[PDB]
Enzyme design. Structure first.
Site, PDB file in Angstrom:
ATOM      1  N   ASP A   1     -96.998 -74.715 -26.996  1.00 50.35           N
ATOM      2  CA  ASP A   1     -97.438 -74.627 -25.769  1.00 50.35           C
ATOM      3  C   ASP A   1     -96.304 -74.306 -24.814  1.00 50.35           C
ATOM      4  O   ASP A   1     -95.147 -73.512 -25.286  1.00 50.35           O
ATOM      5  CB  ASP A   1     -97.598 -76.073 -25.347  1.00 50.35           C
ATOM      6  CG  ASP A   1     -96.735 -76.974 -25.769  1.00 50.35           C
ATOM      7  OD1 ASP A   1     -95.522 -76.837 -25.667  1.00 50.35           O
ATOM      8  OD2 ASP A   1     -96.917 -78.397 -25.392  1.00 50.35           O
TER       9      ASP A   1
HETATM   10  C1  LIG Z   1     -83.815 -87.463 -18.841  1.00 52.24           C
HETATM   11  C2  LIG Z   1     -85.459 -86.938 -18.930  1.00 52.24           C
HETATM   12  C3  LIG Z   1     -86.002 -87.877 -17.920  1.00 52.24           C
HETATM   13  C4  LIG Z   1     -87.521 -87.309 -17.633  1.00 52.24           C
HETATM   14  C5  LIG Z   1     -88.113 -87.963 -16.348  1.00 52.24           C
HETATM   15  C6  LIG Z   1     -89.164 -87.074 -15.977  1.00 52.24           C
HETATM   16  C7  LIG Z   1     -90.463 -87.196 -17.057  1.00 52.24           C
HETATM   17  C8  LIG Z   1     -91.609 -86.214 -16.713  1.00 52.24           C
HETATM   18  C9  LIG Z   1     -92.799 -86.419 -17.677  1.00 52.24           C
HETATM   19  C10 LIG Z   1     -94.309 -86.371 -16.951  1.00 52.24           C
HETATM   20  C11 LIG Z   1     -94.189 -84.977 -16.132  1.00 52.24           C
HETATM   21  C12 LIG Z   1     -95.533 -84.360 -16.736  1.00 52.24           C
HETATM   22  O1  LIG Z   1     -96.165 -85.056 -17.631  1.00 52.24           O
HETATM   23  S1  LIG Z   1     -96.326 -83.197 -15.509  1.00 52.24           S
HETATM   24  C13 LIG Z   1     -98.081 -83.049 -15.724  1.00 52.24           C
HETATM   25  C14 LIG Z   1     -98.501 -81.919 -16.561  1.00 52.24           C
HETATM   26  N1  LIG Z   1    -100.093 -82.041 -16.563  1.00 52.24           N
HETATM   27  C15 LIG Z   1    -100.798 -81.134 -15.739  1.00 52.24           C
HETATM   28  O2  LIG Z   1    -100.247 -80.190 -15.046  1.00 52.24           O
HETATM   29  C16 LIG Z   1    -102.506 -80.934 -15.837  1.00 52.24           C
HETATM   30  C17 LIG Z   1    -102.768 -80.186 -17.019  1.00 52.24           C
HETATM   31  N2  LIG Z   1    -101.987 -80.326 -18.033  1.00 52.24           N
HETATM   32  C18 LIG Z   1    -100.854 -79.478 -18.540  1.00 52.24           C
HETATM   33  O3  LIG Z   1    -100.636 -78.673 -18.024  1.00 52.24           O
HETATM   34  C19 LIG Z   1    -100.031 -79.807 -19.961  1.00 52.24           C
HETATM   35  O4  LIG Z   1     -98.858 -79.388 -19.698  1.00 52.24           O
HETATM   36  C20 LIG Z   1    -100.613 -78.971 -21.012  1.00 52.24           C
HETATM   37  C21 LIG Z   1    -102.115 -79.566 -21.242  1.00 52.24           C
HETATM   38  C22 LIG Z   1     -99.730 -79.147 -22.165  1.00 52.24           C
HETATM   39  C23 LIG Z   1    -100.712 -77.634 -20.846  1.00 52.24           C
HETATM   40  O5  LIG Z   1    -100.397 -76.779 -21.752  1.00 52.24           O
HETATM   41  P1  LIG Z   1     -99.007 -75.779 -21.638  1.00 52.24           P
HETATM   42  O6  LIG Z   1     -97.876 -76.461 -21.652  1.00 52.24           O
HETATM   43  O7  LIG Z   1     -99.034 -74.752 -22.673  1.00 52.24           O
HETATM   44  O8  LIG Z   1     -99.090 -75.033 -20.285  1.00 52.24           O
END
Ligand SMILES: CCCCCCCCCCCC(=O)SCCNC(=O)CCNC(=O)[C@H](O)C(C)(C)COP(=O)(O)O
Ligand SMILES: C/C=C/C(=O)SCCNC(=O)CCNC(=O)[C@@H](O)C(C)(C)COP(=O)(O)OP(=O)(O)OC[C@H]1O[C@@H](n2cnc3c(N)ncnc32)[C@H](O)[C@@H]1OP(=O)(O)O
Ligand SMILES: [Zn+2]
Lengths: 193, 157, 443, 85, 37, 228, 312, 84, 253, 83
Positions: free
Chosen positions: H40
């Site tokens: 991904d």
């Molecule tokens: C020290 C570290 C601290 C971390 C703190 C911050 C942690 C943040 C974690 C939460 C952030 C999120 O989930 S952000 C929310 C992300 N979800 C969306 O945007 C809706 C659609 N789903 C996607 O985009 C997915 O990434 C995917 C299906 C894989 C698309 O595949 P690709 O990727 O190929 O594009």
């Protein structure tokens, strides 16, 4: 411009007045002459070129010192200080070659005679070694002096105009120091002694 | 002499992609017979991107440090390493570049652009601090807005 | 002196002329050199051969600068003052006028100097002038100027310690007292030999001239050919023999062998030259070597014969340079293989080429013939072997001369047409002078 | 002292003004007051040089004779002289 | 065929003349590259 | 010409004296502390002399304040040079006779290094913005606006030059001819009414130039009123 | 109230002219300066008189001819300029009762060296550049708003022509005139561009949105329609208006309006103000020294070279 | 062109070799991050991080977004002037 | 639509402004800056009193600007090479941008001569070039060195002028090849000729002149009348700047 | 006419880059060391001035012969990881 004239003058005077020693400095004279000549030949930078030229000239002054006869020392120091004064306040580049010909020992101007009585006094004690070394270094000077001439004589004439007033604020001293071609008239006689 | 097309600048137009030391691509138009660095100055590069030539009777010539990709290596005009001009070039390597040297390090003053140079892409090479005289030096920091093209003259003195 | 200062100031007025009025610029520049010619004529009319060996004596106080006239200096001055206007006729810039005016002033001042320090100072004051002349940006060679300037400076630097040593030895620098004091003849003799063997082209240290006289333009070429070598011969005659005779004697085998090998190698080297200008350059070497041997012979009439030969070369060789310069300027090249069929193309010019070629080759009805006869008389009286060596190789110079002349003149016509009125006028003084001195030089 | 010292000084001042106008791009003859002032300065300075030569020569003869190096009077005139040579 | 003069002398440079003006460079040779080398 | 040398030396001495006087008055103004002399006011000159060489202007002639003449300029009886025109005679003499107009910002002069003296006849109309260099012109010729006349060409008296054309050097055109083009050439002959219009042309310029002189005199009166 | 509004002497504050002198020192210096001025003037005039005929011409100021009158004639209809009474001296001396001066919009800008006289109307924001001539003497000159006359252009009219039709020259709004252009007896519509160095003859008229190529020659009495580009000598139709070129003309209008405003700002400054600016530049360069002794005590304003506050 | 097309390729293969989510033999000198590898956007970011870490450079986010293939990365590195 | 006032000037805003129709004598300056763009001329430059020069203009060596000529470098930078001739009433102009994509600055090489009535705008003029009268080079065109341009010649934008040739016409076209002598000397001949004329004019420069006397006399009369006015431009400028700052700060929130 | 530069452009530029990918240190240390050496041992040549000229010229020729040029000075030791 300050450094090339004042402390050297004062140190030569103090040497002449209150100094004697029971040794020689000839090897250091060889160092100064040869190193200055070769470096001024080999350094493309104008600043370092004049630096090594100064080293060669101070070696010449030391050679004059070692054989006594401080009159030629005094006059050559005066001529060189005049040239340095003319050097560092230059605004037009046409006169810049005059400094070289007054340093390369070209006949009609004062550098030649200033080196000439020095050679005369060196021969007055038959200091064959240092005299020959001085002659060879004088020859080596001419290369980069002609290079200077090419760099700032056979070039288009251009001089920037002043904008914040002070219009060519050093014409007077420049043109006065230029009048060194008239000096040898009084110089050729036993003057400085 | 016949219906030969009128002479237009397009026929001598040369384009080179130049990327700064900050990684920003820039489009530059070049002309045949002129040096790359002259056009680089003509584009608006900061004065820090240039330096005096370290040779004899050529210290009025500016230059910039760039990297030449492998293909265009043969388009760089040859210079004798044993020559006095070659000695000046080696002094330039010795002083300006130091441990910024790369096998693609080259000097733009020896690049005469032509038809083959169309579409060629190079970037700017980093340099060490330097000083020539009172009126032209390099602090080692590329923080400036003054255009090298804005200097009225090139005073070797 | 007063008249001389008036001319000196009058010549400098060239720079003060605004460049707008070019006609008057040319007129003034030419007239400034015209005047000294008449002045030297007036001097010659004023000289007395029944008077002292030196006449018109003048000294500028304790400032050295002792000026006096002998026959040699007067004749050299006459020849130079004839040469210079032709050189002026070949220039187009004010800078050239100023440089040549200063050069002429220096040459004239040195020609009648009587102070060895004065000769030292005045002679080499033109070295920067020659440096600027030869290595001009569009057509000159910087290397030639570098060469000649370094050679001259090396000679002068070698001489200077000897000059100051004899000054201290005798307390002065006047020849008429230097000639009367006991001195360490050897060191001053080496200095004089070094300088005047650099100035006059003598092997091995002679290599600056072939590059220099070719890289220079026509006017400077004629100047260098006809003047500065004769500064060496007058140098010998005025200084070395009157001052240090024992060194002159003990070095005579060395001087003779060096002159002989110089003449031989220069003569042989010339045939392999492929340019007319280089051919003319090597030609003068043999003449200078012959002059030097004649001076050093001192047998019967050495000074007069040497002066005659110096005048003869300063007359003829500038004509060769004039022809070379005309051909180059109206051809844009000096390479021999582009010269052919010149007689049909340049009838009068080719005729002059022939005549001055014969002049170089010492033929009768020319001053060079009598000159070499007198020089060989002087050489023969010392010994017959040297005279034979000079006599035997006469063919070898005429070889290259005739070969080059026939190659460039005869054959397929291609190149420039004949000469112009200005060019014929420039040729004219040398032809008339050579005829006059080859028919009735004396009376 | 030399006869023509002041004339030499005036000529030097003439060239001085010439080259001053040179250094400012002006015609050689502009600003004649500078020419006059320079002529006066050169005349006085070289007159001072001529007098200083005499001063130094008198010093030389005095020092030489005081050390014990006594001279026949004929050559003393070479040093004890304000000659207008 | 040009006219570098007037009917009464007065040499005309002929800067804007179509014809090739006779000049000092008129009789210059055409250099041979092998000869030059 | 020794008279030229005497004139020249007199001019040089007077020029140096003017230098000294004006410089000393500048110094006096400095002492009085008022720097009006420092003003970078325009120095454009209607009459600009060349050393001793002065334009000669007929008492019945006229030049605009923006119009300028230099060198030995000769403008004849009732001859006009209009606003901003530049006729130059510093290097070569330009001779103009009676009833001739040099229109606004038109050029007549000789500045090519080999340009001979320029001759202008009578009843000569040089159009607005035309350039004339080293040429001679006869009487009664319409010189067109923004046209170019090159050196040593003869415009015979009575011809026509169309506006904006270029006349080649030494290219003589006979009388009564209409010419046009940068490689200029004959087009046709003059018509009767066209010639009549040309013949009526001069007097209108004469009267207008006199009127312009009157207005300029009024303006100079006001300029004096400011300080007088 | 920078830092020393009440302490600085007037000499520093008013460098163009000092106030009246008070002390004996000041009065004596002023008298010596006056004597110097008089002697210098006398020397100057002596040098001029000995110089001869050439010195007869003096340094006299040029009249401000950018706004100069022309003659009110009976037959000539005043429709672009405006009749004004002559100064009383002109009437009392050489019989001038009515003069006509240009009707100029205050927002317009004219260079100080142009030649504009008489029956001329200048549009709002219209511009006349350096070295041009606009002589409205025998007919009218009508210029629209935001219309530019570039350098060394010529604008003139004809009272009498070959066909004898007195035709004024009319220029619309947002109209561009090239450098060293030629205008005589022609009509120019709105949003039109005239090339630099071109030449327009009489009886010609240009529709709105047309292009005049540079250096072209307009034949007498020829009409060129809209949406066309003409070139030649005499001109010929070559090409139609590309879509971008009308917007280019608009950009020319905007940018040259800005240029006219800036040049008016630069030109409309008084002498004393210019000398003040020169002195300010001088002091600023004196302050370009980082080692200037004042820089650890006094902080100066960039625009005025005056202390605003102390540094420490 | 700032680097060799081969050495860059082997370095890329080696830095690809040490990923737990990848098959050591499925990696080819030219492949696709999505179709071939089934990785991904975040895995591609991790790929870009590893490549930049080995090659000692810096890549803005937009260029990484433009990168989706092994040949893309190789040509991007060879086009980078800061290459080492 | 821009106000004629500049509060952010490099020298400060002008307090009092004077109408051009109120001017009773011309005050035309030959050379003057444009905001923060300033001229750069040699010490021995010839500038005719009726010439026009402004702003960021570069001039090298023995170049000359003659009577009524214009160099308006307001939209770009202008450069003038060494010993380059500009005759009467010519214009050297420029634009903000050009279709060619190069610098829009107008470049003039050394030893380049220009006849009267020429318009130069955003063109590169290589050294040793002759420019004819009534001749124009448009934006983005380049003239190679050792070339001669005939008068009454039009050079369209983005065009090229091959060297060693004579060209002309409207539009410009080949005419003939320049002879080797013409390349060698003639260009430099014209350069030196017009430079000599320029220096001839410079010799008799009575600058700043004496015409200021009458204006000074009128001002002195006003002083005697007391109507001549004192104004501190520095402090009035400071007050105007403070007013600008206050009014600007009083309109955001 | 123009002569050709010998060799390949690539090879010659690479030779131009031979032993230059190295930072330049400060010249202060060499200067201090030279001054220290002069201050410490130059007195050894005090007895030298009386020595026979032949030996002194031999020493001069040797000293000139064994000199190594500071400019363009390079060693194999600059790019090796161990002795
Ligand atoms: C020290 C570290 C601290 C971390 C703190 C911050 C942690 C943040 C974690 C939460 C952030 C999120 O989930 S952000 C929310 C992300 N979800 C969306 O945007 C809706 C659609 N789903 C996607 O985009 C997915 O990434 C995917 C299906 C894989 C698309 O595949 P690709 O990727 O190929 O594009
Ligand atoms: C200072 C203020 C400036 C301004 O704001 S505008 C004032 C000055 N502007 C100008 O220069 C206007 C004129 N500019 C142009 O050239 C333009 O408008 C001109 C538009 C019609 C055309 O310029 P272009 O760069 O668009 O050239 P084209 O592609 O239209 O050229 C077509 C054709 O016309 C010819 N042509 C092109 N331009 C001209 C000209 N000028 N004269 C004669 N013949 C020409 C040319 O020969 C061409 O044929 P060839 O070269 O034979 O293939
Ligand atoms: Zn009209």
């Amino acid at each position: 411009l300050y450094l090339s004239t004042a402390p050297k003058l004062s140190l030569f005077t103090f040497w002449a007045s209150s100094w004697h020693h029971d040794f020689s400095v000839g090897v250091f004279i060889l160092f100064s002459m040869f190193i200055g000549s070769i470096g001024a030949y080999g350094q493309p930078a104008l600043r370092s070129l004049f630096a090594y030229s100064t080293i060669n000239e101070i070696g010449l002054l030391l050679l004059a010192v070692e054989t006594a006869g401080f009159h030629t020392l005094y006059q050559h120091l005066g001529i060189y200080i005049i040239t340095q004064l003319l050097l560092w306040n230059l605004t037009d580049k046409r006169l810049f070659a005059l400094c070289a010909v007054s340093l390369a020992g070209l006949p009609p101007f004062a550098g030649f005679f200033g080196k000439a009585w020095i050679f005369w006094h060196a021969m007055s004690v038959q200091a064959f070694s240092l005299l020959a070394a001085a002659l060879f270094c004088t020859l080596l000077s001419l290369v980069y002096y002609l290079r200077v001439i090419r760099l700032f004589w056979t070039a288009p004439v251009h001089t920037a105009a002043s904008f914040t007033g002070a219009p060519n604020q050093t014409t007077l001293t420049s043109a006065c120091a230029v009048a060194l071609a008239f000096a040898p008239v009084m110089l050729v006689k036993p003057f400085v002694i | 002499h016949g219906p030969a097309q009128t002479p237009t600048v397009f026929d001598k137009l040369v384009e080179v992609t130049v990327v700064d030391m900050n990684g920003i691509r820039h489009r530059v138009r070049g002309l045949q017979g002129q040096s790359l660095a002259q056009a680089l100055v003509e584009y608006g590069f900061p004065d820090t991107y240039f330096f005096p030539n370290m040779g004899f009777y050529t210290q009025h010539i500016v230059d910039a440090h760039v990297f030449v990709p492998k293909e265009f290596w043969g388009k760089v005009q040859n210079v004798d390493p044993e020559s006095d001009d070659g000695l000046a070039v080696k002094r330039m390597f010795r002083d300006i570049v130091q441990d910024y040297q790369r096998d693609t390090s080259f000097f733009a003053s020896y690049i005469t652009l032509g038809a083959e140079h169309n579409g060629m892409t190079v970037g700017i090479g980093p340099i060490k601090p330097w000083i020539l005289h009172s009126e032209w030096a390099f602090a080692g920091v590329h923080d400036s807005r003054n255009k090298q093209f804005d200097k009225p003259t090139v005073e070797i003195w | 002196m007063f008249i001389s200062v008036l001319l000196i100031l009058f010549a400098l007025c060239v720079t003060l002329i605004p460049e707008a009025h070019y006609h008057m610029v040319r007129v003034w520049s030419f007239v400034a050199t015209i005047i000294p010619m008449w002045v030297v004529t007036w001097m010659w009319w004023n000289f007395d051969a029944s008077g002292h060996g030196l006449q018109m004596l003048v000294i500028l106080g304790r400032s050295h600068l002792a000026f006096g006239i002998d026959g040699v200096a007067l004749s050299l001055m006459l020849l130079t003052t004839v040469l210079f206007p032709i050189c002026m006729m070949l220039l187009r810039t004010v800078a050239g006028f100023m440089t040549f005016i200063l050069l002429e002033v220096l040459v004239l001042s040195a020609l009648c100097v009587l102070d060895l320090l004065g000769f030292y100072i005045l002679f080499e004051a033109s070295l920067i002038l020659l440096f600027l002349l030869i290595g001009r940006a569009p057509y000159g060679s910087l290397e030639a100027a570098y060469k000649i300037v370094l050679y001259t400076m090396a000679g002068s630097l070698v001489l200077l310690p000897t000059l100051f040593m004899i000054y201290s030895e005798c307390g002065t620098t006047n020849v008429l007292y230097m000639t009367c004091a006991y001195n360490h003849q050897t060191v001053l003799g080496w200095g004089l030999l070094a300088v005047l063997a650099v100035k006059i082209p003598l092997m091995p240290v002679h290599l600056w001239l072939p590059e220099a006289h070719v890289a220079a333009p026509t006017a400077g070429s004629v100047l260098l050919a006809g003047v500065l070598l004769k500064l060496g011969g007058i140098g010998f005659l005025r200084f070395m023999l009157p001052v240090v005779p024992e060194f002159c004697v003990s070095v005579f085998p060395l001087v003779s062998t060096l002159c002989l090998v110089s003449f031989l190698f220069s003569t042989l080297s010339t045939l392999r030259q492929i340019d007319l200008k280089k051919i003319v350059a090597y030609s003068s070497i043999a003449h200078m070597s012959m002059v030097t041997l004649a001076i050093f012979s001192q047998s019967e009439f050495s000074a007069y014969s040497s002066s005659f030969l110096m005048i003869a070369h300063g007359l003829i060789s500038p004509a060769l340079f004039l022809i070379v310069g005309i051909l180059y300027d109206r051809a844009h090249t000096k390479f021999i293989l582009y010269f052919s069929g010149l007689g049909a193309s340049m009838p009068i010019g080719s005729t002059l080429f022939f005549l001055f070629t014969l002049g170089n080759l010492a033929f009768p009805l020319f001053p060079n013939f009598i000159a070499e006869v007198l020089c060989m008389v002087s050489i023969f009286a010392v010994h017959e072997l040297l005279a034979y060596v000079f006599c035997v190789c006469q063919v070898l110079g005429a070889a290259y001369g005739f070969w080059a002349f026939n190659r460039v003149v005869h054959g397929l016509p291609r190149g420039p047409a004949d000469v112009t009125r200005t060019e014929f006028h420039t040729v004219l003084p040398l032809l008339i002078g050579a005829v006059w001195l080859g028919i009735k030089p004396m009376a | 002292g030399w006869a023509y010292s002041g004339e030499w000084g005036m000529l030097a001042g003439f060239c001085f003004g010439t080259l001053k106008n040179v250094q400012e791009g002006k015609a050689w003859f502009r600003r004649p007051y500078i020419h006059g002032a320079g002529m006066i300065a050169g005349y006085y300075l070289f007159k001072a040089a001529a007098d200083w030569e005499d001063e130094a020569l008198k010093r030389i003869i005095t020092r030489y004779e005081r050390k014990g190096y006594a001279i026949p009077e004929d050559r003393k005139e070479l040093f004890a002289a304000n000659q207008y040579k | 065929e040009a006219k570098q003069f007037t009917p009464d002398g007065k040499y005309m440079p002929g800067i804007f003349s179509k014809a090739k003006p006779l000049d000092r460079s008129t009789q210059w040779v055409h250099k041979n590259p092998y000869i030059e080398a | 010409n020794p008279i030229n040398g005497l004139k020249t030396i007199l001019h040089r001495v007077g020029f140096a004296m003017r230098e000294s006087g004006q410089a000393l008055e500048r110094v006096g103004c400095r002492l009085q502390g008022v720097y009006s002399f420092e003003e970078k006011l325009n120095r454009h000159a209607t009459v600009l002399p060349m050393r001793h060489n002065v334009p000669s202007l007929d008492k019945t002639s006229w030049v605009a304040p923006s119009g300028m003449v230099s060198g030995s300029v000769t403008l004849g009886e009732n001859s006009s040079v209009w606003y901003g025109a530049i006729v130059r005679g510093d290097f070569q003499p330009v001779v103009v006779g009676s009833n001739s107009n040099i229109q606004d910002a038109a050029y007549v002069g000789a500045t090519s290094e080999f340009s001979g003296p320029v001759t202008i006849g009578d009843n000569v109309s040089v159009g607005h913005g035309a350039v004339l260099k080293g040429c001679t012109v006869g009487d009664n010729v319409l010189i067109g606006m923004n046209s170019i006349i090159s050196e040593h060409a003869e415009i015979q008296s009575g011809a026509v030059i169309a506006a904006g054309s270029y006349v080649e050097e030494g290219t003589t055109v006979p009388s009564g001819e209409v010419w046009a083009g940068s490689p200029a050439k004959k087009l046709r002959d003059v018509r009767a009414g066209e010639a009549e219009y040309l013949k009526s042309l001069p007097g209108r310029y004469t009267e207008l130039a006199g009127e312009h002189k009157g207005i300029m005199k009024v303006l100079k009166m006001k300029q004096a009123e400011y300080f007088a | 109230m920078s830092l020393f509004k009440s302490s600085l002497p007037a000499g520093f504050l008013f460098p163009y002219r000092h106030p009246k002198a008070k002390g004996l020192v000041e009065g004596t210096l002023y008298g010596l300066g006056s004597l110097f001025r008089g002697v210098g003037a006398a020397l100057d005039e002596l040098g001029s008189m000995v110089q001869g005929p050439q010195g007869s011409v003096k340094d006299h100021v040029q009249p401000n001819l950018a706004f100069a009158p022309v003659h009110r004639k009976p037959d000539v209809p005043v429709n672009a300029g405006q009749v004004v009474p002559a100064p009383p001296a002109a009437a009392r001396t050489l019989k001038i009762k009515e003069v006509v001066v240009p009707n100029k919009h205050s927002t317009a800008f004219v260079a100080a060296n142009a030649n504009v006289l008489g029956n001329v109307k200048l549009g709002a924001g219209s511009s006349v550049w350096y070295g041009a001539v606009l002589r409205g003497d025998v007919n009218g000159i009508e210029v629209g708003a935001n219309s530019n006359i570039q350098d060394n252009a010529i604008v003139h009219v004809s009272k009498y022509s070959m066909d004898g039709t007195a035709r004024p020259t009319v220029i619309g709004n947002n109209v561009t005139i090239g450098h060293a252009a030629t205008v005589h007896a022609c009509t120019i519509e709105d949003n039109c561009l005239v090339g630099m160095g071109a030449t327009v003859l009489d009886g010609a008229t240009v529709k709105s949105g047309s292009i005049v190529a540079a250096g072209a020659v307009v034949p007498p009495n020829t009409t060129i329609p809209s949406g066309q580009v003409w070139a030649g000598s005499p001109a010929k139709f070559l090409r139609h208006l590309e879509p971008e070129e009308a917007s280019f003309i608009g950009k020319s209008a905007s940018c040259y309006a800005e240029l006219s405003a800036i040049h008016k700002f630069e030109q409309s400054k008084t002498f004393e103000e210019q000398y003040t600016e020169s002195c300010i530049i001088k002091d600023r360069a004196a302050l370009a020294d980082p080692s200037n002794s004042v820089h650890q005590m006094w902080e100066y304003d960039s625009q005025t070279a005056l202390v605003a506050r102390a540094k420490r | 062109g700032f680097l060799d097309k081969d050495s860059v390729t082997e370095r890329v293969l080696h830095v690809t070799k040490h990923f737990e989510k990848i098959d050591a033999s499925k990696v080819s000198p030219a492949a696709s991050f999505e179709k071939d590898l089934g990785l991904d956007s975040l895995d591609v970011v991790e790929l870009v991080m590893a490549l930049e870490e080995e090659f000692g450079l810096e890549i803005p986010d937009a260029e990484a977004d433009k990168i989706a293939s092994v040949g893309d990365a190789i040509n991007y590195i060879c086009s980078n002037p800061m290459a080492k | 639509g821009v106000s004629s006032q500049f509060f952010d000037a490099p020298n400060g805003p002008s307090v009092k402004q004077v109408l051009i129709e109120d001017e009773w004598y011309n005050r035309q300056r030959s050379i003057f800056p444009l905001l923060d763009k300033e001229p750069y001329y040699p010490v021995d430059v010839f500038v005719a009193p009726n010439a026009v020069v402004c702003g960021d203009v570069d001039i090298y060596g023995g170049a000359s600007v003659f009577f009524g000529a214009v160099l308006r470098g307001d939209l770009n930078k202008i450069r003038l090479g060494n010993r380059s001739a500009i005759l009467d009433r010519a214009v050297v102009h420029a634009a903000r941008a050009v279709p060619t994509g190069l610098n829009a600055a107008t470049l003039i090489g050394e030893k380049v001569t220009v006849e009267p009535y020429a318009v130069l705008r955003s063109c590169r003029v290589e050294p040793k070039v002759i420019i004819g009268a009534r001749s124009v080079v448009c934006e983005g065109a380049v003239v190679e060195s050792e070339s001669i341009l005939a008068p009454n010649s039009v050079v369209p934008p983005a065009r090229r002028i091959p060297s060693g040739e004579l060209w002309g016409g409207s539009p410009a076209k080949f005419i003939r090849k320049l002879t080797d002598h013409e390349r060698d000397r003639v260009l430099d001949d014209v350069s030196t000729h017009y430079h000599n004329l320029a220096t001839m004019f410079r010799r008799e420069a009575l600058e700043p002149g004496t015409a200021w006397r009458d204006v000074e006399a009128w001002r002195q009369k006003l002083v005697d009348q007391g109507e001549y006015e004192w104004i501190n431009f520095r402090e009035q400028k400071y007050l105007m700047r403070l007013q600008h700052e206050a009014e600007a700060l009083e309109k955001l929130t | 006419y123009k002569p050709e530069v010998p060799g390949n452009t690539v090879d010659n530029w690479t030779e131009l880059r031979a032993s230059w990918n190295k930072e330049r240190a400060s010249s202060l240390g060499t200067n201090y060391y030279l001054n220290v050496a002069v201050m410490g041992f130059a007195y050894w040549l005090n007895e030298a001035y009386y020595f026979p000229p032949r030996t002194l010229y031999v020493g001069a020729l040797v000293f000139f012969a064994l000199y190594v040029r500071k400019a363009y000075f390079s060693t194999p030791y600059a790019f090796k990881h161990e002795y």
